[PDB]
Amino acid sequence: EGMRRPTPTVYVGRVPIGGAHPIAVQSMTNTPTRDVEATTAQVLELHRAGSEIVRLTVNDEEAAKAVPEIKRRLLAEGVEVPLVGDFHFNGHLLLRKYPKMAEALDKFRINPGTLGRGRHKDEHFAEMIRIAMDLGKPVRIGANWGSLDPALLTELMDRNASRPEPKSAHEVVLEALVESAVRAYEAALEMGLGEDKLVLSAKVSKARDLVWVYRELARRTQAPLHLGLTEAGMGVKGIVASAAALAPLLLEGIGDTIRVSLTPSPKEPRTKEVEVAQEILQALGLRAFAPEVTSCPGCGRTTSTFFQELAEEVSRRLKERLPEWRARYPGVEELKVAVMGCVVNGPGESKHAHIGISLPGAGEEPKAPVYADGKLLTILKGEGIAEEFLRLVEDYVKTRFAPKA
Amino acid sequence: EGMRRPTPTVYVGRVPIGGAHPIAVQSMTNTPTRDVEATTAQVLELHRAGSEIVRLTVNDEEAAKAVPEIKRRLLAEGVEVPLVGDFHFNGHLLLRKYPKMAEALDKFRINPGTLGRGRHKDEHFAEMIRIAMDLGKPVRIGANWGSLDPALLTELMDRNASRPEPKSAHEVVLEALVESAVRAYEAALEMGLGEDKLVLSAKVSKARDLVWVYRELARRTQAPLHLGLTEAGMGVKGIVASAAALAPLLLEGIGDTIRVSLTPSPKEPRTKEVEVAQEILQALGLRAFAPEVTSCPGCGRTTSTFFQELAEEVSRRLKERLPEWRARYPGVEELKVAVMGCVVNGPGESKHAHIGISLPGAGEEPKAPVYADGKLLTILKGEGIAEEFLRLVEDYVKTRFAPKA
Ligand SMILES: C/C(=C\COP(=O)(O)OP(=O)(O)O)CO
Ligand SMILES: C/C(=C\COP(=O)(O)OP(=O)(O)O)CO
Ligand code: SF4
Ligand code: SF4
């Protein structure tokens, strides 16, 4: 778009991850995995909302035993969404003990910071890779600075201490995180895990750090990169931090799949993080999921209640019509609609949309121009402007995005 | 931090804008400017929420007649927030006819696309600039692709047609927008408007485009830059788009004041855009407005309702106590609190905060280790871990951010 950083293709189930493929949205469940009903339902829900890949924790024996049945229930519904198993501390134990789960999973996640501490640490690593290789499973090697390999930090602390100009302890923590991921990645390649089976990540919780980190990742490896700002937080803060962190990197062509790590409000659904990941990619023109509305903030030049109501109804109708438009009209995901408050930027901004309307603001003739494909399509006056506009959009979508050839 | 693109300082009222100064948050009212009662109220509201400068439309005579009164009322409350006047089409008439309005304002906004169409557009431009200079008022020359100079687009469209390889119609639009701001900028300086009286913007409604644009503006001029994604839209979309548009630029050191162009929902207050502007800068470490919470998404390894509720309670308490902490504890705005769901990343991430808590996972003990200043502080057990942690948080602040000198 672009342009994309070159990487081999990693297939997570039927979903290809890589530089020649769309950046894939994924998310993670928060149901107890031992609860097959709750976990199956949420996987469905996340998949429904647009999660192309879904991760779940496989944290103990009960969780592992449920994974085949969850996978069974998804398949019985024709739901071929890929499951990634999240493993910490005991990943080698469960995968060994439970081969039906290892087989059920479509990808394993390994954290090089939660393997175990020492010389059995390598064995756990090697066991997990071996099982992936025997089954032909892809692996994510994912570092996270909340669980940084202490031995590596020490080693780089030692290294940095004797540089002619030592770097800051903070910069060294980052170095050590990158180094954890890269060295684990290179160890897996040395064991013979194919380039087409290995995804990397190395997450931190501050936007400025994360850009540093993934720039080094991209520089030092060829692997597709899983990008996210971990422990993003709640509400507006969590949404903003996630977007601000990922955007500079994505605009640089770094990132091949993303997850947004929002803390849900108790009154919020787990599908919200999917919404955010989608809006990030679409805002950067890197994906198109669903029609969008470009609207002005409204100011003293337009009637506030009228305007905000019109903008809200247009966005709700688009969302309403989307399930039908997907089936009927292929390509409708790229639809861009404008709703503007007055003649200052109304017409101009409307012409940058597929279709748009500007209301007459203060000082203006009581008319509301509608533009389509850059030129005046018609002029609305009177009551029922919202529904009139939405009829124009409906016909527009039918015409521009109709199936052809 | 950084580093900041160097610029002269432009004082908007008492608010300094420039490379040597904190990036200033601003906003814009949407009340009828002629409604003194409504508009004074909203300016206070926005200033209270943290808008350091507030813009209001001055679109007509009635609007103009109100601005001196609005300013009077703000000042009688000891509120010295700078007011920016947004002018289109008739700025020269209003500024000429209503000199007290000209004086009451703290800054004038000019749009080079809404001046008039041709050579009287220069006369309108010059009158406004001349008035600004006589009063020593700062000016923003703000271009917007929703009101792009049509003669300018034609010219560059024609010029581009004769390049050995013409650019797309889209890229030229961006070209013309830069050139509109750049040309108006050099025109105003040639008129003798001071470098310390000139701020620039050139806004588009698409992130990737906005990055290209402000990179060009930054390169071709020396002026402080007002940065924003115009017509950002509603809800999560508008929030994400604003964040993703501004972050790449701010991280590059481009941008000296920001505005977030959110379309409010009818049930949301005009202050949300200020909230978002705040979160953008604090996420990138550029400002510190208020304590923040770093929290995990939660997963199958912890109990959802408890974790999400506790995280919420922490964030609400921070918000509740800040007015008190603001007076008592200088610097508390930098406070970072972590709330984590389990032992995998809990301790690590917590040790990266000022104070944080690691909760007991689905592998259980109702007890939660608390970290402060990078090390283990204590271990809470039993019921009321939530309330006990928050008492620890209050005590932490009382000690860490205690009065000094
Ligand atoms: C579950 C977990 C961390 C946060 O979920 P995250 O998607 O923020 O990070 P990671 O899993 O490291 O990619 C364990 O590292
Ligand atoms: C009111 C207005 C535009 C939108 O408010 P904006 O702050 O999004 O854009 P601008 O004012 O052009 O910097 C007039 O261009
Ligand atoms: S389009 Fe008009 S009403 Fe909307 S923000 Fe711009 S000037 Fe104000
Ligand atoms: S800290 Fe624990 S509960 Fe939270 S997301 Fe990470 S692994 Fe899951």
Side-chain angles (χ1 to χ4, degrees), chain B residues 16-54:
Chain B
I17 304 308
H21 307 279
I23 297 175
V25 172
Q26 62 179 277
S27 62
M28 181 165 188
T29 57
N30 61 357
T31 58
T33 300
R34 62 177 58 192
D35 194 326
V36 172
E37 185 175 73
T39 304
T40 309
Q42 207 183 57
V43 173
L44 294 170
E45 195 185 18
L46 294 174
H47 186 232
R48 185 176 210 272
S51 195
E52 291 168 305
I53 292 166
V54 178

Side-chain angles (χ1 to χ4, degrees), chain B residues 110-224:
Chain B
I110 294 173
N111 183 334
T114 63
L115 298 168
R117 315 273 204 275
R119 305 180 81 182
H120 286 314
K121 102 170 170 65
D122 303 329
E123 294 183 22
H124 306 156
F125 185 77
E127 183 162 18
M128 298 187 75
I129 294 292
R130 197 154 289 157
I131 291 161
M133 289 186 302
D134 295 343
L135 295 160
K137 300 287 177 174
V139 176
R140 172 162 64 100
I141 305 186
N144 188 310
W145 75 348
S147 45
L148 176 74
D149 189 354
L152 207 82
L153 177 64
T154 280
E155 181 203 338
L156 278 68
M157 274 306 260
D158 285 349
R159 150 173 142 187
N160 183 68
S162 65
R163 294 176 173 151
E165 286 287 51
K167 305 175 176 179
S168 67
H170 180 71
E171 180 173 6
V172 179
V173 159
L174 301 186
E175 284 191 338
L177 190 70
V178 169
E179 197 71 22
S180 172
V182 172
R183 283 184 188 167
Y185 164 73
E186 297 183 13
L189 286 161
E190 279 166 4
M191 290 187 50
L193 186 59
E195 256 207 294
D196 59 332
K197 297 291 173 48
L198 196 46
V199 170
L200 304 187
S201 68
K203 293 183 195 167
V204 310
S205 63
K206 274 307 174 298
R208 179 181 303 270
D209 292 342
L210 187 76
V211 181
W212 187 89
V213 165
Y214 273 73
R215 276 177 190 170
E216 277 288 290
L217 280 192
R219 181 180 69 85
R220 299 183 58 191
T221 76
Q222 305 181 1

Side-chain angles (χ1 to χ4, degrees), chain A residues 1 280-288 334 336, chain B residues 206-208:
Chain A
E1 305 294 357
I280 291 174
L281 293 183
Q282 185 156 328
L284 295 173
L286 296 170
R287 295 286 305 274
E334 287 192 307
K336 319 290 175 184
Chain B
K206 274 307 174 298
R208 179 181 303 270

Side-chain angles (χ1 to χ4, degrees), chain B residues 339-357:
Chain B
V339 176
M340 300 285 297
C342 89
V343 80
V344 169
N345 292 304
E349 184 71 48
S350 296
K351 284 187 235 190
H352 283 287
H354 285 92
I355 191 177
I357 192 173

Side-chain angles (χ1 to χ4, degrees), chain B residues 320-387:
Chain B
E320 283 180 14
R321 310 290 291 126
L322 180 55
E324 167 177 351
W325 287 349
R326 266 197 167 105
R328 268 191 189 252
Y329 312 108
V332 77
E333 296 82 0
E334 290 189 309
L335 182 71
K336 320 291 175 184
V337 179
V339 176
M340 300 285 297
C342 89
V343 80
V344 169
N345 292 304
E349 184 71 48
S350 296
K351 284 187 235 190
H352 283 287
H354 285 92
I355 191 177
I357 192 173
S358 195
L359 298 166
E364 308 154 8
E365 289 183 39
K367 73 181 214 303
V370 179
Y371 302 83
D373 300 322
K375 25 188 194 163
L376 180 64
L377 169 70
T378 191
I379 298 179
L380 304 181
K381 67 172 180 287
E383 300 173 335
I385 291 177
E387 221 52 58

Side-chain angles (χ1 to χ4, degrees), chain A residues 296-302 307 340-346, chain B residues 86 88 231:
Chain A
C296 76
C299 75
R301 296 186 61 108
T302 198
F307 168 63
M340 306 286 294
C342 89
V343 86
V344 173
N345 290 303
Chain B
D86 211 56
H88 308 271
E231 333 307 27

